[PDB]
Amino acid sequence: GHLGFLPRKRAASIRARVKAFPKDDRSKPVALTSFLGYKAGMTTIVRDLDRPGSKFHKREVVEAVTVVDTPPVVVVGVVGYVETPRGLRSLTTVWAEHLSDEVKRRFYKNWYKSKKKAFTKYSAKYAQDGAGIERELARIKKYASVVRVLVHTQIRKTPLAQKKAHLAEIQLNGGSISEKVDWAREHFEKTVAVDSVFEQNEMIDAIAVTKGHGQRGYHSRTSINHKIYRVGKGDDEANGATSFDRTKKTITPMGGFVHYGEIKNDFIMVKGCIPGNRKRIVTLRKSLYTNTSRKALEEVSLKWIDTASKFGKGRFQTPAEKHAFMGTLKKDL
Amino acid sequence: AKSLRASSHLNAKSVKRRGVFQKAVDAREQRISDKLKEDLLKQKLEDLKKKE
Amino acid sequence: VEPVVVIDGKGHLVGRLASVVAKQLLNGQKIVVVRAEELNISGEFFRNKLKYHDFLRKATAFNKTRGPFHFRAPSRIFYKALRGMVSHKTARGKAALERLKVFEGIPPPYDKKKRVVVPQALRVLRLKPGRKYTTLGKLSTSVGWKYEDVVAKLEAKRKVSSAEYYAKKRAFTKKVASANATAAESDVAKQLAALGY
Amino acid sequence: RQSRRTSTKLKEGIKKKASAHRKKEKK
RNA sequence: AGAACUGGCGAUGCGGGAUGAACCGAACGUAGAGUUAAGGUGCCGGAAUACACGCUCAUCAGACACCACAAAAGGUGUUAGUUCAUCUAGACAGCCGGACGGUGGCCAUGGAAGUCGGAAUCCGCUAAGGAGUGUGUAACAACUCACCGGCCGAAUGAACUA
RNA sequence: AGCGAAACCACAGCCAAGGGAACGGGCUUGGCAGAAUCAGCGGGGGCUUGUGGCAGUCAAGCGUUCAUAGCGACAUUGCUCGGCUCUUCCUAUCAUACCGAAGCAGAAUUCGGUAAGCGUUGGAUUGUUCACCCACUAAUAGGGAACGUGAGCUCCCUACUGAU
RNA sequence: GGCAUUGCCGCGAAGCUACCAUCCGCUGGAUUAUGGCUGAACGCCUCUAAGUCAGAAUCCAUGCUAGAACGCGGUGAUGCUCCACACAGAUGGAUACGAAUAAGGCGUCCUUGUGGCGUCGCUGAACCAUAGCAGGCUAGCAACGGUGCACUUGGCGGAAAGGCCUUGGGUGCUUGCUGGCGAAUUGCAAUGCGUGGGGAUAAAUCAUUUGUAUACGACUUAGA
C-alpha cells in the first residue's frame, strides 16, 4: 500500500479539519474561504460536453455527481492569530452574545441534565456600550496576521436528528485586518448564504472522514479539484428543472434520498464522489490557488437531472409520472 | 514524460493564472456584499417590527 | 558574578561557544543563549550543509519515527551540539540542560536586559581573517526551519523599539557626563582623584 | 561513506603486516 | 612452513590504550601525606580555550597506530629547496613592425606555390627569417609562431626535490 | 459466572557501532526512554573490480664504482536440486529526465556526463536445467540483505499494525 | 404451509463487495552535470580564486497523513461556604543600541553628507549602589533634591506581552552637614500554605437510547 497515508488510524472526530487555507489577495475585499455541509447520496447527470479539442466535443455525456446538503451558516465569533517563531498562536477569540441552542449544545456532552448556563456571564460582559468586548476586538485589530471566523451548522433546518451544531474555523482572505474584523463585527449572528461562497462551474476541494468498516477505514481524506455543477436554493421551487428540461421537480428523488431526507434548503452538486458517506459532515475549501486548465475554464450546460428513486429501481421521475403511466388503481377509486 | 514537479507544466500553468477565474470570483464577491448584506437589512426590518 | 548570564550567539562558533556554555552549567551556571540563528561555524556553507544531511539520513530502520530526530530550528541545532558534552542521561546531566535555554531571536524578558559574549569564541577573533564561514540562518532553512523570516521581521521590530530606547538614554547620560563635568573640579572631587575616582 | 575507527583486528593486523615487512627487507 | 633461543600469559590483580588474551607503565598487608610512571589537560574527564615557530581547506579533511596496503603516477592547489639559463649590452609578459631572395626546390599529378604526400632539407642576403609550427585555399592569398627589432622598465623561466 | 492444571524457571530482555578469537545478553561510545493494558501477523530467536604470460628496440633513475652485478614505469615488435512470491537498500543506469561530443541535414543511432526520483514481461525445455529463441512494451539494468521468505516450496522474549 | 442439517427454480431491494465499474491525483525555492557574465592569479587569456546569471524526473519547501499520550494557546461554566485539624543551591545590582571588525563608538559644526573637526578604546581592575542594634531611640542646620511605601492620572509592551515607565497628593527615611544617647556577660573561633467530613452548585461518567462507529474498548447520537 501507499506509505504517505500513515499512520492509517482513526480520525480525531466525525468532523475532519481543514489542514491548509487559501493564501491571500490583498486587493480583494473580505471573503470567506470555505463552507460546510452534509453528504446526501449520489445522482446521475447528463450534459453536452462543450470541451474543445475533444473526442466527446458537443456530444451528450453521462456522469455520477454527489449532492451535499449545505444550509446557510451562522457566525458566532471571530479569532486573531499572531505569527510566532513557533508558528501561530491564537491570542484572542471573541464571540457574539446571542448564541443558539444548537451552538451551546456543542459545549455540553450531556445537554439534558445541564442547567444550560453557558455563555451567560460572558453575555453580561457584552451588556454595555462595549468596553471589554470592543477592547478584545482592538486587540486583534492591532496584532495578528490571519483572522478566522467561528461558525456553526444550522442543524434544525437539516433532516438529521443529531441536533448538535458543528463548530468549524474558517479564515478570511480579504485584504487588510482592519477590514477583516469590521466585516466580522457586522456579520455576528447573521446567517451566511452558500451561493455567496461558491458559484457554478468552479473547482473546489472537499474534506470528509471516510466510510468506516470494521483497523481499516475512518480516516480524514481531502480530495482536490472537483467541479461544482449546481448551486441550488431552497426557496426556489424546481431545482431539478434545467434550462432544457424545465419540468417542475426537485433534485430529491421520490421519497427522499437514500437514508437521507428531503432537501428543503440550499445544496451543492459536485462532480464525482466526495469521500465518506451520507450524513457525514463535509467542509468545502476553495482550492488554494488558481488552476487555469481547460478542465477548469469550461462553463457547463446541464441538460437533465435524474430524480428517479434509487431505493430499489426508478422507472419514473415525479409522482405525476406514476399515474400518467399506470392510469388509476384500486385504492384511488 | 514530465512530472507534476517538472519545469514544463510549472511555467505553462503560471502564464494563464490571470484569466477569467480571477474575475469570476470578483463577480461573485459582489453577491457576498449583496444578499448577505441584505440579511443584515432584513433582520433590521424585524428589529423595526420590534421597535414599533 | 551574576545569576543569569544571557549570552548571545551573533558571531560565535557553534562549537566553542557550546563547550563553554557547557562547563558553565556543569559548574552550576544559569545561562541563556539568544539570537541562535546568527550563530556561526567554520567552513564553506555547502558543507555544514553536508556534515549535516548525512546526520539527517541516520534515522532508524524498522521504525523511522523512534530514532535520531533531526531538529531543524537553529536553537536546537545548537542545543544538540551541546547536550553532547554533558553526560546527559545522569541526574548531574539532566540537572544541567535543565539550567540551559536557547532562543532564536531574543524575546522577552531578555530583550530588555543586557547580554554579552564569550570572547574565546567569536568568528572575528579566531578565524584566520578572511576564511569560509557559515551562518546557521541559511544553514537551518536549507533544511527545514520555517521562519527565518518571522524571526527576521518580527526582529527589525525589536532593534527598532530599542535603538529608539538607546537615544533616550544617550540623551540622558550626556546630561550627566555634563553635570559631573561642571560640578567636577571643585574640591571634594579633586581629593577623590588623589585617591583615584 | 567510509569510517575512521580502526577495528582492533586491523589495528593489530597492521603490526602483523609491518612485522612481515621487517623480515622481508633482511632477506 | 619447519628448527633453535629469550621473554609474556599461564597460578596475576593495579594505572593507561573510548572498549580487548598478546600493547604502554607498574608485580598487591591496612592507612595518612608527598612525588611521579604510562597516558593525557576544548567539553563529556581530573589537568594550560598555555606560550613559541611554521605548515595545511579537503564535495563527507585530519587526529590511520614497525609511515604498511591500495602507491607507480596525476593536479593552472600551496609552501620551501636543489640544479641549469637569461638579466639596466633592457630579460619575462604584452599590443606594433619585419618574418625575405634562387624559389611557385625536386619526384608524385587534373590540381601541390611551407602547410593531402616521398626523399634532400641547400644557398644568398642580413638584425633575423624553419625548402617551414598551425588556420585556410581546387591551387594561391591573408593570418601564424620561431628568429629578430622598437615601444615599456626587473627580476624571470626551465627541469626537478621535499 | 463457577471449578482449575502442567511443562518450564540463574537473572533480565530497545536499537547503532566497537568490543581481536566462526562469543555477544550484561561492558565502551551514542540514539534514546514516562505509569497501566487489550487485539493482530504467523515476523525474527581494510579482502575485491579492466586490459594474459613469454622473449625484445625500449629508457627516467637506482644499482659497493654505475647502464652493462643488472633491474627498470607507460608503450610498441613477435604466437594466439534450481527458481516462484513479498519487503528493503546499493549505483557500477536498461528506460524516463536534462546536457556534452559525432559528416549528427531531418528522423533514428553510437559514445560520454549528473542522477537510484519512478519503472523493469510472457511461452516450448527438468536422464543429473548447469543451453536458447519470436511475442509485446518506453525499457523489459545488474546486485546485496548467507543456511534471505527449506519449521510459504519441487502457553521462552520482543519488533511491528492498531486500540484504550 | 406445520416441517425439509439453509428443499429446488424464477427474480429481488438492503447489505458483503470488485478494473468487473465512476471521480480525483500540486507549485515555489535551492542545486548537480552543463552553458555563461565580470575577472584575477600570471602587464595576454581563462565560467572561479573573491564575485555573479540560468539550469536535472534531484534536493528542500508548498500541498497530503498523524499529532508529542510528560509540546503549547485561546475561549465557555461556579470552586464557594461550615466545622475539625495540620505548616541541583537567595545573601549588594541580569549594569537593555544596532552593524562592522582592512573598522568602530562618543562629542561638535552644519555645506545634511560613505561630510569635516575633536576625542575614546589597548578589558567589568569599570559602572551604579555602598557608614547606622542584621543596622536602634531622639536635637537641629542646609537643601526643594535622593529614595522607600501603599494609592491615583495618563501612556507603552502580543515573540514567551504578564512588565516597563510617568502625573498628582499623603506618609516614612535621608550618611548632604552637625549632633545627643544605647551596644558589653554571646566571656578567645563553631552560618545565627494541605487534609475529612458536611452544605449550596457547575459538569462529567455509569445506566438508557441512536449508528455515520464497533473484536472488546473507544467513537457518534437522544432524553427533566
Curated annotation (Swiss-Prot), chain A:
Named from the GO MF annotations, one term is: RNA binding
Location of this chain's protein in the cell? Cytoplasm
Keyword vocabulary terms for this entry:
Cytoplasm, Isopeptide bond, Methylation, Phosphoprotein, Ribonucleoprotein, Ribosomal protein, Ubl conjugation
- Modification sites for Phosphoserine: S13, S145, S243
* InterPro entries (UniProt xref): L3_arc_euk, Ribosomal_L3_dom_3_arc_sf, Ribosomal_uL3, Ribosomal_uL3_CS, Transl_B-barrel_sf
Q: Which GO terms describe its biological process?
A: cytoplasmic translation; maintenance of translational fidelity; ribosomal large subunit assembly; rRNA processing; translation; translational elongation
Which Pfam families would you find in this protein's record? Ribosomal_L3
Q: Which residues form a coiled coil?
A: none
Gene3D superfamilies found in the cross-reference section = 3.30.1430.10, Ribosomal protein L3, domain 3, Translation factors
Q: What happens when the gene is disrupted?
A: A mutant confers resistance to trichodermin, a trichotecene toxin produced by plant-pathogenic fungi.
Question: What residues bear Phosphothreonine in this entry?
Answer: T92
Q: Where is this cross-link: Glycyl lysine isopeptide (Lys-Gly) (interchain with G-Cter in ubiquitin)?
A: K28, K125
Claim: Phosphoprotein is one of the keywords in the record: yes
Q: Which GO terms describe its cellular component?
A: cytoplasm; cytosol; cytosolic large ribosomal subunit
PROSITE patterns hit by this protein: RIBOSOMAL_L3 (PS00474)
PANTHER family given in the database record: 60S RIBOSOMAL PROTEIN L3-RELATED, LARGE RIBOSOMAL SUBUNIT PROTEIN UL3
Q: What else is known?
A: Present with 450 molecules/cell in log phase SD medium.
Q: Which family does the similarity line name?
A: Belongs to the universal ribosomal protein uL3 family.
Name listed for the protein in its UniProt record: Large ribosomal subunit protein uL3
Q: Which organism is it from?
A: Saccharomyces cerevisiae (strain ATCC 204508 / S288c) (Baker's yeast)
Per the UniProt record, the lineage of the source organism begins with:
Eukaryota, Fungi, Dikarya, Ascomycota, Saccharomycotina
Curated annotation (Swiss-Prot), chain B:
**GO cellular component terms given for this protein:** nucleolus; nucleus; preribosome, large subunit precursor
Report the coiled-coil segments: none
Residues spanning the membrane: none
Could you tell me where the Polar residues compositional bias lies?
Answer: 1-11
> Which intervals of the chain are annotated as region Disordered?
1-20
> Anything else of interest in the record?
Present with 6210 molecules/cell in log phase SD medium.
**The family this protein is said to belong to:** Belongs to the UPF0642 family.
Under what name is this protein listed? Answer: UPF0642 protein YBL028C
Q: What is the lineage of its organism?
A: Eukaryota, Fungi, Dikarya, Ascomycota, Saccharomycotina
Q: Which residues of the intact protein are shown?
A: 2 to 53 of 106
Curated annotation (Swiss-Prot), chain C:
Looking up CDD domains in the UniProt record yields: Ribosomal_L13
Record-level Gene Ontology MF annotations: mRNA binding; RNA binding; structural constituent of ribosome
Location in chain, cross-link Glycyl lysine isopeptide (Lys-Gly) (interchain with G-Cter in ubiquitin):
K175
Write out the GO cellular component annotations: cytosol; cytosolic large ribosomal subunit; nucleolus; ribosome
TM stretches of this protein: none
Coiled-coil blocks: none
Q: How is it modified after translation?
A: N-terminally acetylated by acetyltransferase NatA.
Q: Where in the cell is it found?
A: Cytoplasm
Which UniProt keywords are present, listed alphabetically?
Acetylation, Cytoplasm, Isopeptide bond, Ribonucleoprotein, Ribosomal protein, Ubl conjugation
Keyword presence, ATP-binding: no
The protein's superkingdom reads Eukaryota
Which biological process annotations from GO are given for this protein?
cytoplasmic translation; maturation of LSU-rRNA; negative regulation of translation
Query: What HAMAP family does the annotation carry?
Result: Ribosomal_uL13
Subunit-structure text: Component of the large ribosomal subunit (LSU). Mature yeast ribosomes consist of a small (40S) and a large (60S) subunit. The 40S small subunit contains 1 molecule of ribosomal RNA (18S rRNA) and 33 different proteins (encoded by 57 genes). The large 60S subunit contains 3 rRNA molecules (25S, 5.8S and 5S rRNA) and 46 different proteins (encoded by 81 genes).
Q: What family does the database annotate?
A: Belongs to the universal ribosomal protein uL13 family.
> What PANTHER family does this protein map onto?
LARGE RIBOSOMAL SUBUNIT PROTEIN UL13, RIBOSOMAL PROTEIN L13
Q: What else is known?
A: Present with 43300 molecules/cell in log phase SD medium. There are 2 genes for uL13 in yeast.
What's the protein here called?
Large ribosomal subunit protein uL13A
Swiss-Prot record, chain D:
Subcellular localization: Nucleus
Q: Where is the composition biased (Basic residues)?
A: 1-8, 16-27
Q: What is known of its domains?
A: In contrast to other GTP-binding proteins, this family is characterized by a circular permutation of the GTPase motifs described by a G4-G1-G3 pattern.
The family line of this record is: Belongs to the TRAFAC class YlqF/YawG GTPase family.
The record's function comment reads: GTPase required for 60S ribosomal subunit export to the cytoplasm.
Other notes: Present with 7130 molecules/cell in log phase SD medium.
Name listed for the protein in its UniProt record: Nuclear GTP-binding protein NUG1
Biological source species: Saccharomyces cerevisiae (strain ATCC 204508 / S288c) (Baker's yeast)
Instruction: Tell me the name of the encoding gene.
Output: NUG1
